[PDB]
Amino acid sequence: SPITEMIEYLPECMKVLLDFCMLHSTEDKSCRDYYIEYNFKYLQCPLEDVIYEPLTALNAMVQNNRIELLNHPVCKEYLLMKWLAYGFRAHMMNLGSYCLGLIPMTILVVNIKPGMAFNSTGIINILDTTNSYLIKTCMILVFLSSIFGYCKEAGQIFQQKRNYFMDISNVLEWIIYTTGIIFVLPLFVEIPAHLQWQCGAIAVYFYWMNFLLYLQRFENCGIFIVMLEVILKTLLRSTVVFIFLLLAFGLSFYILLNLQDPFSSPLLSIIQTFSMMLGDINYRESFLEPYLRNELAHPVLSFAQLVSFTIFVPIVLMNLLIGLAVGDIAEVQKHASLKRIAMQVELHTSLEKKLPLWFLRKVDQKSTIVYPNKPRSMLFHIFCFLFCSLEMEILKQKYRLKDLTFLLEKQHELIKLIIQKMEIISETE
Amino acid sequence: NYFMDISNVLEWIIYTTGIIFVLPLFVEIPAHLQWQCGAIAVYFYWMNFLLYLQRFENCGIFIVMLEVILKTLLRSTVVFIFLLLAFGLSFYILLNLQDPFSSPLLSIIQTFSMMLGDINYRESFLEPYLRNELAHPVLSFAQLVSFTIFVPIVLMNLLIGLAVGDIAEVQKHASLKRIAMQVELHTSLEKKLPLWFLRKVDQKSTIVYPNKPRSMLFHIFCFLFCSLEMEILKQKYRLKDLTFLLEKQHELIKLIIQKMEIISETE
Ligand SMILES: CCCCCCCC/C=C\CCCCCCCC(=O)O[C@H](COC(=O)CCCCCCCCCCCCCCC)COP(=O)([O-])OCC[N+](C)(C)C
Ligand SMILES: CCCCCCCC/C=C\CCCCCCCC(=O)O[C@H](COC(=O)CCCCCCCCCCCCCCC)COP(=O)([O-])OCC[N+](C)(C)C
């Protein structure tokens, strides 16, 4: 299609073409009745036996890195119309389906004291029925949300066909739903309180850790999560150097400092050196005051181990992590403004494939009218409250020089023809 | 139009709170409310004086960098809230018998204090474990190692990288920003002056003596005070002139062949 070819090859002509789809009313910004009109006849499907994915021109602009065309106001109003059509509704539905399981477990935690067992009748201590209705409704909501998650994931097992294995969000959801089921089960089957609160800890922790993955779809929140992913994978890659260096210092401090309680076991010494990584060395408690009481076996080697540990782990390794973090964040923020709109257009073109086609005909609109002086009204007010080039130059240079040398070659051939056909009298010999 | 401005809000807080701090010369007020207002009044006076420091040249760029990093932290605060709420509710569950985690809100504030690296490993994790006072000890040490990996190492270095990027972005254009703020200050202050004063104080030419230092007031003021794109563009202009002249020359040579006389070279 010619629009995709203009996006791929000559984007400035596509900008000129998009400039025609901006109809100004009277060129007076002070007028309350002033408006502008956006037409979307070039952004639509090329048909309007092969099939096309939705948002053809937008995917072509994203895949060709034409970020100056994504920031064009026709494209911005096209994404805004596409959002207010169905995307906000589907996104709030998807978020509420998880938040319906998120909220009552947090209420159930912050009301009931940990350690105690509780049925649907109340808190077993002797028992009370003060807020038993709220506890019962919260356990019913968490149980129904968990079995709905089981049904959805059991559908996605047969839908994915052994392709969901290399995904951490599915693993987190299995942990959340199983652990919340075991936390809720004392309304049916009696379970001791130790296992119940052991599961309540893990369930609340992984609920609020998994909600960050639902935060990826926003524009003002996704880039922090992307940077978090990059730095966490880099730490994952450095963990073996972490393990061997920390194991060196842990076994060494297990040997030299044996009589002290923080280094009694080798595993406790490993965890103590991991706590000492950040700089909480405890110099006076572990090294100085045992030395002044003659309680250090091998004191000279102990202070040498202290100065070697303080040089290696909290200074060198931590600044290595800081430098890796600065490099990775600079790498991500080099391409952030394209990444935001790319995630938005990927969200819209992934959600639009599953919608029914009559709904897609009914909600679609080919042109919009914006009044700049009149603010949008209630729901839109609440939404506004909650919301708050040298390579191509040398390439053109090279094209013009190639045209120049072609014309000069033709001219040289014509001059040789002149010498071949010229008449020479009184200049011979 | 003054609604979307934080300096006006700070000034409302300062003047109301200072009025309530001063009022016991007129109307008797208990000392609790009086010193409660004195705290807030002194704090916001000295926080607001930084905004008055923006108009200097040697001081404004630090305030601009402070604005940029503080707005970036404002943008990251929701990830802060959810991550810290995860760890706060978790340590409220597993560490219940200890005084720093008695309430859920106290556990939230304790994890916020543990953000920087003041973990208190020996007081909260080790010595209760050696006295058999930890319910769920294995899960507690797993929560400890997970917290120490996530919050003080990963999130703080994320803040450091964002800070380095923002400060590099600001100091890329600092020398223009200083003189731009100065000329904006002068062109904003000059609009409100009376025009006869602007005629009287203006001067069309100055004389500077480099060898003689300026005198007293000026001495106290001196004591208190202490390109490849255009090249290729010109390249492109010269090449366009070159190809225009060569086009004219080619047309002249075709005219030569059109008007040339050929004898004894035909056929
Ligand atoms: C002595 C000891 C020394 C040891 C040193 C060890 C040092 C090693 C340190 C760290 C390595 C371990 C990191 C594990 C996860 C990293 C990969 C990952 O999730 O990235 C990506 C998302 O991730 C993100 O970008 C968001 C981040 C939020 C996820 C947090 C949950 C983790 C809780 C665990 C805590 C367990 C503790 C439990 C205890 C009770 C997922 O990968 P992807 O497929 O690219 O993206 C798909 C994303 N969608 C499409 C699915 C949405
Ligand atoms: C568990 C908890 C977890 C929570 C995590 C939370 C993390 C979130 C962290 C931070 C977000 C909160 C930041 C609030 C202000 C940021 C915007 C701002 O002022 O920037 C700009 C100026 O600002 C500057 O550049 C100078 C900076 C000085 C101002 C300090 C006063 C703040 C005192 C509050 C303390 C309250 C405490 C009181 C208690 C007693 C103003 O914006 P502007 O209009 O662009 O510029 C106009 C400037 N002129 C023209 C007017 C001059």
DSSP sequence for A320-347: HHHHHHHHHHHHHHTTHHHHHHHHHHHH
Residue to mutate among B245, B247, B253, B258, with most A CBs inside 10 A, is: B253
CB contact under 8 A, B250 and A411: yes
The continuous run of DSSP H or E covering A67 comes out as helix A67-70
DSSP assignment letter at A118: E
A132-140 contacts: CB < 8 A, separation 24 or more?
A: A134/A107, A135/A108, A135/A111, A136/A187, A137/A104, A138/A104, A138/A105, A138/A107, A138/A108, A139/A104, A139/A108, A139/A184, A139/A187, A140/A187
Residue A257: Cβ within 10 Å count: 23
Q: How far apart are the first and last CA of chain A?
A: 67
Nearest to A275 among B121, B153, B158 (CB): B121
Residues of B in contact with A198 (CB under 8 A): 136, 139
Q: How many CB atoms lie within 10 A of CB B143?
A: 21
What's the residue count for chain A? 429
Residues in chain B: 267
B118 to chain A, any CB pair closer than 8 A? The answer is: yes
Is B242 in contact with A401 (CB distance < 8 Å)? no
Residues 6 or more apart whose CB falls under 8 angstroms from that of A137 comprise A104
The two three-digit tokens of residue A37, written as one number: 């009109």
Give the HSE-up count for residue A244: Cα atoms under 13 Å, Cβ half-sphere.
Answer: 3
What is the rounded distance in angstroms from the CA atom of residue A161 to the CA atom of residue A153?
Answer: 12
Number of C-alpha atoms within 13 angstroms, CB side, residue A361? 4
**Can you tell me whether residue A38 is helix, strand or coil?**
strand
Which letter does DSSP use for residue A263 in this model?
G
Chain A residues lying within 8 Å of B242, measured CB to CB: 404
Nearest residue to B257 (alpha-carbon basis) of A413, A82, A286, A330: A413
The pair of three-digit structure tokens given for residue B172, joined into one six-digit string: 């890329």
Looking at residue B260, its amino acid is: M
**Experimental technique:** cryo-EM
> Are A204 and B104 a contacting pair at CB < 8 A?
no
Tokens representing residue A324 in the block: 């890796």
Q: Is B23 annotated as a binding residue?
A: no
* CA separation, residue A61 to residues A66, A82, A332, A393 (Å): 5, 17, 20, 21
Could you identify the atom of ligand 2 that is nearest to the CA of residue B10?
31
Neighbours of B125 (CB within 10 A): 20
Give the closest ligand to the alpha carbon of residue B142. 1
* Among A243, A246, A263, A245, CA closest to A254: A263
- Three-state SS for B39? helix
Contacting residues for B10 by C-beta, under 8 A, at least 6 apart: B44, B47, B48, B51
What are residue B235's phi and psi, to 5 degrees? -55, -45
Q: Token digits for B208? A: 């500077």
- List the structure tokens of A336: 């952030």
Nearest chain A CA: its distance from B230 CA (Å) = 11
Q: Using a 6 Å cutoff on CB, does residue B63 contact ligand 2?
A: yes
Conformation bin of residue A222: beta by default, left when phi > 0, alpha when psi is -120 to 50: alpha
The Cα B70–Cα B129 span in angstroms is: 40
For residue A408, give every residue at least 6 positions away whose Cβ sits within 8 Å of its Cβ, in sequence order, or none: B246
Please, is A173 exposed, middle or buried when counting C-beta atoms within 10 Å of its C-beta (0-12, 13-18, 19+)? buried
Measure the CA–CA gap between A138 and A130, rounded to whole angstroms: 15
**A232 pocket-lining for ligand 1 (C-beta < 6 Å):** yes
Pick the residue from chain A with its C-alpha nearest to B139: A198
Ligand nearest, relative to CA of residue B77:
2
Cβ <8 Å between A393 and B117 = no
Sign of the CA dihedral running A101, A107, A110, A112 = negative
Radius of gyration of chain B (CA): 35
Q: How far apart are CA A114 and CA A132, in angstroms?
A: 16
How far, in Å, from the CA of A209 to the mean position of ligand 1?
A: 10
> For residue A272, what is the enclosing H or E element?
helix A266-276
Tell which residues of chain B come right before a gap with C–N over 2.5 A: 215, 226
CB of A183 within 8 A of CB of A105? yes
Query: Please, are residues B126 and A261 in contact by the beta-carbon 8 Å criterion?
Result: yes
User: Which helix (H) or strand (E) is A368 found in, with range?
Assistant: strand A367-370
Question: Hunting for tokens 């000279």 — which residue is that?
Answer: A300
- In angstroms, the CA A9 to CA A1 distance is 12
Q: Which two tokens stand for residue A386?
A: 């909650």
Q: Is A228 in the pocket of ligand 1 (CB under 6 A)?
A: yes
List CB contacts (< 8 A) between B149 and chain A. 235
Angle between helices B156-171 and A222-256 (to 10 degrees): 120
Report the C-alpha dihedral over residues B179, B180, B186, B187, rounded to 10 degrees.
150
Three-state DSSP class for residue A226: helix
Half-sphere exposure of B38 (CA within 13 A, CB side): 11
Final resolution, Å: 2.8
